[PDB]
Amino acid sequence: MAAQLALNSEASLWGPYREIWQTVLSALIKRQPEAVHSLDIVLKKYKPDFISLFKNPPKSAQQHERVQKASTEGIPIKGTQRTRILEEQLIKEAFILSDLYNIGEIAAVELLLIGEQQQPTFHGLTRGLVAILLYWDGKSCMAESLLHLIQARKGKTFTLDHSPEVVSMVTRFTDDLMEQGLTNKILTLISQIDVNNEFDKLKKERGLGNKKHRKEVSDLIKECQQSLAHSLYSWSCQTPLNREDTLLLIGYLEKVTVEGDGSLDKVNLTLLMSLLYCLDVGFLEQGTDDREELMKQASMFMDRQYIAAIHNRLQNTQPWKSPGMQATVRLAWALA
């Protein structure tokens, strides 16, 4: 019987992600000893969501037929032993949300039912407009959970006074995520997420609310991009990226442009800082006694090809879209 309850567990896009974030905050930021046991259970349970990062549950012809028959046969929803009959309006809204975000029809129904439950906190919005906020809030909670897990790893810069057991658990969990190509996923997501493209999708289906709702959706999207960029930054501050991930970050910054005032935007400034921290060697100046052990931990001294690969990439190549940003990385490399 537990396996049929587990199969509906994977369909919810907000409630579980908010529970993950609250557990991560309570264990790592608030240092609550009771929350550490809950953190281990949550990290083991939702490891596939962190590995897949922002991946939506896929559409299914069996889910489509069930949601279409839900006005007569009823659907089993999470937490309820009884099938619930769904209104024809909610069934139509679920197909619109399923088409908009390419999510499974049960996940769209669950997100709308949570959006109907939260409709009193979001006054003047329809359940579908609230479901759009909760969709991006759930992605924000997953990105912030990843950021705080990376900050609480063993490294050089952020010292969160945690027990060695929690630090070891979080470090093992976050190492397993990096081996699954976390850097390439983050840079791909930051490239794909655009407020204008999302507003054009929402505008086609009339999913744009009042001036406040447009701001809240824009702010949640920008937070997701910023927390993802901070995740790579906070990583690079704790431990220097490997040869392949450093080359991916360089290959992203090659394509970046400056704002209309001549400044870098928040996300690209953070990613430039991530690369500048990957190029930091001044920990070699600050101690005589731990010097050999710190040299053994730095990725630049572990891989004999790291220096040659980065040097050749900065020496032999096409002008970046921002020549000044290329010049900053070359100066940092020359000093390194």
């Binding site: 396996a3 550490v36 046991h37 809950s38 953190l39 281990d40 259970i41 990290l43 083991k44 490891k47 596939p48 590995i51 057991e165 929690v166 658990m169 979080v170 470090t171 093992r172 969990f173 976050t174 190492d175 397993d176």
Partner: protein, 358 residues
């Protein structure tokens, strides 16, 4: 019925990768059922853990592979059991990074201890096959060592003791945390005496090199744990062998430095051995031998002062000057022989070089 026939056909056709691509909810119950009922239990457990690893169920993968490693079977060699334990550890580490359960940490520690015990078991097996291949009981002993993972107590009493495997006995007592200083000294003596016996057909230089490689290899394992590396006994015993075989007096000092024994700690041992005034050295007509070894050790420090950490170098040079002053006073109390006058000259030259380093 159809899914069972398809799975059995894919298994019979050796299409294991395609079977593991089938996201069928009936595959796991089928593999678990077949791993309980079928004679080919190994093969179905192998498919079952690969299915769990592919589905990122690392806790269940680790438990199936640990159970494969513990399973009494002549079909699973000790080398394959070690591969299974190593894979169980890799899966358990992947799970503990995701899971804060104390039970996943305890299980990981049990697997790490079991891997160490199983490596000693493999060392016994490989030593029996290499050194006792002609002994009638070794075929049976090797097959028993493949058939299951053994407890340390059984490995000691049934294999390491009857076959006089002093290196394996030392590894066993290290792994068990059992500390008997007399037993540790006896085991090191047996290892040295065996290496000296096995090399009796070789040149004096090849015998010296064989013993050096042996003592350096074991010394690098045990020198971090003083309970299993009786440095004073080892230095004394090896210096007695250097005298017995008329080897280079530098041999013990060089071998201990290659093990990473600190020069100050090695000097403390030689100073103690010299001050102990053991009648053995006079009986062997080599009363200056320990002072020759001290001179070689300290000459090596004077040539390369980086062998001593910079923060203790000044203190250590002063300790050497005080020690040399004591050795020179004792040498003046002995009968004037040409060898003694040379030793006194060497220590005065060494003193004048150490005064330039202070």
């Amino acid at each position: 019925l159809f899914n069972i026939a398809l799975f059995n056909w894919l298994i019979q056709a050796d299409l294991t990768d395609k079977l593991l691509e089938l996201n069928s909810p009936f595959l796991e119950p089928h593999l678990v059922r077949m791993a309980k009922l079928d004679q080919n239990k190994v093969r179905y457990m192998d498919l079952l853990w690969r299915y769990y690893e592919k589905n990122r169920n690392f806790s269940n993968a680790a438990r199936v592979v640990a159970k494969l490693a513990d399973m009494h079977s002549p079909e699973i060699s000790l080398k394959q059991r070690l591969e299974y334990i190593s894979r169980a550890i890799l899966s358990a580490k992947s799970s503990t990074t995701m899971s804060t359960l104390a039970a996943d940490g305890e299980f990981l520690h049990e697997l790490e201890e079991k891997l160490e015990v199983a490596r000693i078991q493999l060392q016994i097996q490989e030593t029996l096959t290499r050194q006792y291949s002609h002994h009638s009981t070794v075929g049976d002993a090797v097959s028993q060592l493949d058939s299951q993972l053994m407890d340390i107590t059984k490995m000691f009493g049934q294999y390491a003791d009857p076959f006089r495997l002093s290196e394996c006995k030392l590894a066993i007592i290290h792994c068990a945390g059992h500390s008997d200083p007399i037993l540790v000294q006896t085991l090191w003596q047996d290892i040295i005496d065996k290496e000296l016996s096995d090399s009796m057909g070789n040149s004096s230089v090849d015998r010296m090199q064989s013993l050096h490689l042996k003592i350096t290899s074991l010394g690098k394992i045990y020198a971090s744990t003083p309970r299993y590396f009786p440095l004073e006994f080892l230095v004394k015993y090896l210096e007695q062998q250097v005298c017995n075989f008329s080897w280079d007096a530098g041999f013990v000092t060089y071998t201990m430095q290659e093990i990473n024994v600190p020069v100050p700690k090695l000097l403390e041992v030689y100073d103690h051995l010299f001050k102990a005034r053991d009648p053995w050295w006079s009986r062997m007509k080599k009363p200056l031998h320990l002072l020759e070894s001290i001179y070689i050790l300290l000459s090596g420090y004077v040539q390369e002062p980086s062998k001593v950490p910079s923060y203790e170098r000044r203190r250590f040079t002063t300790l050497c000057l005080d020690a040399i002053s004591c050795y020179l006073v004792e040498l003046q109390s002995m009968d004037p022989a040409p060898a003694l006058l040379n030793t006194v000259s060497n220590f005065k030259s060494l003193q004048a070089k150490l005064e330039r380093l202070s």
